[PDB]
Amino acid sequence: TPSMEDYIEQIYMLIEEKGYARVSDIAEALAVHPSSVTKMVQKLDKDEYLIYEKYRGLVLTSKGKKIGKRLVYRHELLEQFLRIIGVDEEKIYNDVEGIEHHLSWNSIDRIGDLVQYFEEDDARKKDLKSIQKKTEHHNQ
Amino acid sequence: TPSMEDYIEQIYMLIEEKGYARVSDIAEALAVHPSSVTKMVQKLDKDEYLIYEKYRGLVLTSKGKKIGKRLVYRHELLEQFLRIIGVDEEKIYNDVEGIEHHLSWNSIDRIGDLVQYFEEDDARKKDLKSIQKKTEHHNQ
């Protein structure tokens, strides 16, 4: 599920940055109703991605951690990608949040190589940028 | 609406390639129930994107034609893009069909410049490909 991936990716980030995370952290983070969060967490608990105890709070199972880290890698690769090709900083999160779920892993890998391509030599970055310049010259 | 864009893009292609197009052409093309197609066409008629008459069949209004052509440009740019970075031919349509709706126009433009970048010089294409080679060498 697409919103599943959002939850897993989000819970992953919440645990990582806060250590302790709850249903409230997810709600706030996703701007969703906590009751809806609970229902989701329960399905996730059922599919054995996580564990939601008292003193424990949310804890990702070994399986949740592999997937979660994969989703986090994917999300950040997409941001870097869009940033690299010149998308306006303000547009990135939104676009990345939508497409991340409709890209195959085979594509995610090709996007990875593509980022490497530009990352290993600025000459390439300047040639790409110069295309954007001429493309938008009628507005400068 | 995302499925709206699919319909408009599809009706556009159907008119272009067949001249005459009906509700049945859409159903078949989108693998959707025709009754559902009718309901959609009626909303589209209401928002003045198209005209659905007897001898006329489906006809895009001047407005439907600008948007439709824009959606068709977008869809094909995405295919070319993925193909250009090495995504397996079999994966392209699916990935393109999902992401096309969650990319801003600002991104679609940067994707355009990026395609130009590689299209104007094969040297660039060979350097990108060589990255994919080394990336997958453990499987050759």
Ligand SMILES: [Mn+2]
């Ligand atoms: Mn994400």
Ligand SMILES: [Mn+2]
């Ligand atoms: Mn998302």
Ligand SMILES: [Mn+2]
């Ligand atoms: Mn399409």
Ligand SMILES: [Mn+2]
């Ligand atoms: Mn689509």
